[PDB]
Amino acid sequence: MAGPLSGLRVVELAGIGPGPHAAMILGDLGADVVRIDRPSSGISRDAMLRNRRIVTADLKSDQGLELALKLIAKADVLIEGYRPGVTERLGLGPEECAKVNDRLIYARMTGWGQTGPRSQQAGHDINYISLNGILHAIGRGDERPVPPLNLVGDFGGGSMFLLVGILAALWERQSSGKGQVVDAAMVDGSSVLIQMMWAMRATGMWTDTRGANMLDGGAPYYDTYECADGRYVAVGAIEPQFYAAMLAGLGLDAAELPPQNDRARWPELRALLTEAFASHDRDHWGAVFANSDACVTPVLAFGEVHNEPHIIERNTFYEANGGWQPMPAPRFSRTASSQPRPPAATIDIEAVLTDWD
Amino acid sequence: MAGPLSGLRVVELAGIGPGPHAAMILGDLGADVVRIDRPSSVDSRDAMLRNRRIVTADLKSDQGLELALKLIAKADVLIEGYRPGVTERLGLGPEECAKVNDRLIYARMTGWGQTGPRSQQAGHDINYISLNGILHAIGRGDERPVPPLNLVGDFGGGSMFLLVGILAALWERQSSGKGQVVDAAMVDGSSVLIQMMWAMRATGMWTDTRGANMLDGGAPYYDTYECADGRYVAVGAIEPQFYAAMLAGLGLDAAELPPQNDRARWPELRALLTEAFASHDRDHWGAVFANSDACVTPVLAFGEVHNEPHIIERNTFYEANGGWQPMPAPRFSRTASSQPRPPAATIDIEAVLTDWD
Ligand SMILES: CCCCCCCCCC(=O)SCCNC(=O)CCNC(=O)[C@H](O)C(C)(C)COP(=O)(O)OP(=O)(O)OC[C@H]1O[C@@H](n2cnc3c(N)ncnc32)[C@H](O)[C@@H]1OP(=O)(O)O
Ligand SMILES: CCCCCCCCCC(=O)SCCNC(=O)CCNC(=O)[C@H](O)C(C)(C)COP(=O)(O)OP(=O)(O)OC[C@H]1O[C@@H](n2cnc3c(N)ncnc32)[C@H](O)[C@@H]1OP(=O)(O)O
């Protein structure tokens, strides 16, 4: 198994959203990932289950439980993404696991956390980010907030903090001999993910008004613009020098414009930039600003990404199954990840135990 | 120093965006983090620079270069986020560091990658997520894409993958006795962050049309709703049992609505939910649905977060310098993080070498 995490052993209790994602990235980086699902559920067609061995096991039977504790005893990391109390009642809780393996990294992935008034409340991404200020800050000012898919609570503020916790605990274990419990709550991870805004708010550089900020779409130089063909470019020319280069490429004389950061005149600046970008198509601007520091890029739909030179040449994607999927990230000079293995048809939990003795 | 990364030594070549966020988190979890800025910037209110020692050094000079190469010699990790070729030309490239410390994790944080046609273009978050299909997918169907702040490219798809690569490489160094180069590019990280959508596209369960999918605001049961007071709730009632609980709380009989997943009749369903949510204020809905699985939560503004019971009790935030800031994530049972230390005055680079033996 290729990658920096070769020989890491991971048991994943099947859930949804962050847990599977974290487990995927471990697999991607060459960890040995065994996913316990329930027998009620051919080859699974969710490519988020790549780089896994899938076993079934009724964890409510005494046999399925025992079989599971046998895996966990042979493993470095356990991931679970159920409401609190769930693993405990299965007899798979942190304390039961410590009995069969005091070295285990016990990784708990929730939205709301392990305790507290909301800890038994069902939820999805959109809910975890509603409570901590994040969702309110996203979208245009004249409109209701828009969910940034499930990228911020589940993955960015969720799976990724679970991973940072699993791997920091493994480092700590190198010196202590011992495992421990990682409590990764989406409401917490996503708040750290957005620490920059909390910092900026303290220094009066961010307001709670939606659509009135440097990075939320309010700044005319950090937003998308519609082009003559109805497609879009993104402009991100925060630095004055990059901003100047953008104006020149648009054909606009800086002298006739309001200042870049005179916020009172932003509506006026935006009207001028809107008219300029609308006068040619997306691909024209892509060509004009190639090799430039103007921070102007075409906004590609998923279906066009495979045709973009910079994407093709770094192999950010590989072809699979129905189509393209992202190659592992990040990349390693010496112990390079390899292409993911497709979702690996159900194997028998005994076989795995033989393999791991 | 409290936390799982106690004893980890980190050298950070001062930059912007992901690199400082990654460095912040390492420090958050107990790492000993030393930040080399240029003296050209000598004065900090940026609470992203918490858990840090700051030092000055003209790396263009001979003395600067040598003092930096000494710190790097005595450290586990180097973080840099300059364009490719910068550290090489400065004499702090991977090869030069390898000659003074072959245990070093050499962590390279860019947007576009170390090579390829865009590898030298300036950019920010909005640029990196524009090329890989992400930005096009965010926002309402009848409007241009809206940036999800800088959450998806800088942090979730940037710093967080940097952290995972650093920590994965540290694990690997337990076997090999050798460091390596981590190449974290925001266009790759963010692509893995959205792997779900790439999977779902392959199986026909996600389209390239903005605002017409399950998780982008197109589903009436996964979206925000405006209330009587002009504030908002979030609805995330994906599973039919949670949807049913929401309907009951709204006072709508299932028998009068279209089916939850009859997409052709989503216009009607949205109209019905819209009218219902509009009939009371946010805080009313917050009360009705506390302790429910209805997946309905108030959309709070930053400024209101500190009064939410569940946030207070879990101490998701701490006070510092006229404003709240997030506590470290995730959480650790045995080697818990401590409250971050604020930015300090600059320290002498000699005194750091002295302290580090
Ligand atoms: C691909 C297209 C589909 C769309 C994807 C969905 C959207 C993306 C996800 C997000 O946006 S994050 C959303 C999920 N939130 C979390 O994961 C936070 C923590 N988890 C939860 O809050 C709950 O797991 C959740 C609300 C998601 C679902 O609640 P359930 O009540 O279905 O499950 P719960 O976690 O409470 O318990 C699972 C049950 O399965 C049982 N179980 C688990 N594995 C088993 C096994 N192998 N055999 C037998 N039983 C098993 C477990 O024993 C337990 O039984 P109990 O009835 O005794 O409590
Ligand atoms: C701080 C204000 C508020 C923050 C708002 C912005 C936050 C949002 C951030 C985002 O959305 S991600 C944006 C950043 N993108 C990246 O970080 C990807 C990789 N970095 C880059 O693409 C470039 O660094 C960047 C476009 C951000 C800036 O380009 P520059 O052309 O200013 O720097 P470049 O990387 O080429 O080189 C850095 C320079 O500093 C010099 N340098 C650095 N540390 C030095 C030192 N200590 N002493 C002397 N010289 C030093 C280095 O020599 C070199 O100068 P020279 O070309 O003149 O040699």
Residues of A in contact with B137 (CB under 8 A): 149, 302
The C-alpha angle with vertex B326 and arms to B307 and A190, in degrees rounded to 5, equals 95
Which chain B positions have a beta carbon within 8 Å of A163's beta carbon?
160, 163-164, 167
For chain B, what is the radius of gyration of the CA atoms? 24
Q: Report CB contact under 8 Å: A215, B191.
A: no
**Which residue in A212, A156, A273, A61 sits closest to B163, CA to CA?**
A156
Those residues whose C-beta lies under 8 Å from the C-beta of residue B206, and which sit 6 or more positions away, are B197, B200, B213, B214
Residue ranges and CATH numbers for the domains of chain A are 9-193+327-356 (3.40.50.10540), 222-309 (3.30.1540.10)
Distance of CA B343 to the CA centre of its chain: 20
For residue A57, give how far its alpha carbon lies from the nearest alpha carbon of chain B (Å). 23
Maximal CA-CA distance, chain B: 78
Identity (one letter) of the amino acid at A73?
A: A
The rounded distance, in Å, linking the Cα atoms of A27 and A2 is 10
Angstrom distance (rounded) from CA B73 to CA A138: 43
Query: Measured at the alpha carbon of residue A244, what is the angle toward residues A242 and A249, in degrees to the nearest 5?
Result: 95
Q: What interhelical angle do A62-73 and A349-356 show, nearest 10?
A: 30
| CA separation for the pair B323, B106 (Å, rounded) | 34
Do residues A8 and B171 lie in contact, with contact meaning Cβ atoms separated by under 8 Å? yes
Edge-to-edge strands, sheet with B331-332: A53-56, A32-37, A9-13, A77-80, A105-110, A180-185, B331-332
Q: Does A77 touch chain B (CB under 8 A)?
A: no
Residue type, B96: E
CA angle A277, A282, A285 (to 5 degrees): 65
| Chain A interface includes B151 (CB < 8 A) | yes
Active-site option among B37, B154, B188, B216: B154
Q: Which runs of consecutive H residues, i.e. helices, occur in chain A?
A: 18-28, 62-73, 86-90, 94-100, 125-130, 160-176, 186-193, 195-202, 240-250, 266-278, 282-288, 309-313, 349-356
Secondary structure (DSSP) of A6-25: TT-EEEEE--STHHHHHHHH
Contact partners, residue A255, CB within 8 Å, separation at least 6:
none
* B79: nearest Cα among B64, B97, B67, B56: B97
Token pair recorded at residue B65: 């270069």
Crossing angle of helices A195-202 and A186-193, in 10° steps, is 60
- Measured in degrees and rounded to the nearest 5, phi and psi for residue A5 equal -105, 15
Query: If DSSP codes are grouped into helix, strand and coil, which group holds residue A119?
Result: coil
Burial of A305 (0-12, 13-18, 19+ CB in 10 A): buried
From A28, A76, A154, A216, the catalytic residue: A154
Nearest CA to ligand 2 atom 29: B122
A301 touches chain B (CB under 8 A): yes
- Binding positions of B for substrate are 38, 57-60, 81-83, 89, 123-128
A198 touches chain B (CB under 8 A): yes
Residue B108, classed as helix, strand or coil, is strand
- C-alpha triplet A289, A293, A296: angle, nearest 5°: 50
Task: Give the mutation target among A16, A87, A151, A346 for probing the ligand 1 site: most ligand atoms within 8 A of CB.
Answer: A16
Q: What is the DSSP string of B252-305?
A: --GGGS--TT-GGGHHHHHHHHHHHHTTS-HHHHHHHTTT-SS-EEE---GGGG
Question: What experiment produced this structure?
Answer: X-ray
- Integer Cα distance of A193 and A185 in angstroms: 12
Got the DSSP string for A19-72?
HHHHHHHHHHTT-EEEEEE-TT------GGG-S-EEEE--TTSHHHHHHHHHHH
Helix residue ranges per DSSP H, B35-134? 62-73, 86-90, 94-98, 125-131
> Is B124 among the catalytic positions?
yes
Q: Which residues, 6 or more positions from A14, have their beta carbon under 8 angstroms from its beta carbon? A: A20, A35, A36, A37, A38
A317 closest CA partner among B236, B132, B255: B132
Q: Do B29 and A131 touch (CB under 8 A)?
A: no
Q: What Å distances lie between residue A282 and A127, A234, B163, CA to CA?
A: 35, 10, 35
The residues near A40 (Cβ < 8 Å, ≥ 6 apart) are: none
